[PDB]
Amino acid sequence: MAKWVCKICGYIYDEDAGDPDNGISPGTKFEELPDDWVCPICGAPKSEFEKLED
Numbered sequence: 381m382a383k384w385v386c387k388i389c390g391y392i393y394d395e396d397a398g399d400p401d402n403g404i405s406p407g408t409k410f411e412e413l414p415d416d417w418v419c420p421i422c423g424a425p426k427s428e429f430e431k432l433e434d
C-alpha cells in the first residue's frame with residue numbers, strides 16, 4: 381500500500397503499518413483515517429501529509 385509523509389516532522393504514515401497505538405489497524409488507507417487523526421509524533425492534522433508518489 382501507499383506511504384505518506386508528515387511534511388512537518390518526517391513521520392511516515394505507512395498504510396501497511398497503520399497506527400495501532402492510536403486506534404488504526406494495519407492496512408488502513410490514509411483517506412480512511414478519521415478527519416481528526418493527527419501525526420502521532422508532532423500532532424499535525426491530516427492536511428499536512430503528502431502522499432509519496434509521483
Ligand SMILES: [Fe+2]
Pocket residue numbers: 386387388389390391419420421422423424
Ligand atoms: Fe508529524
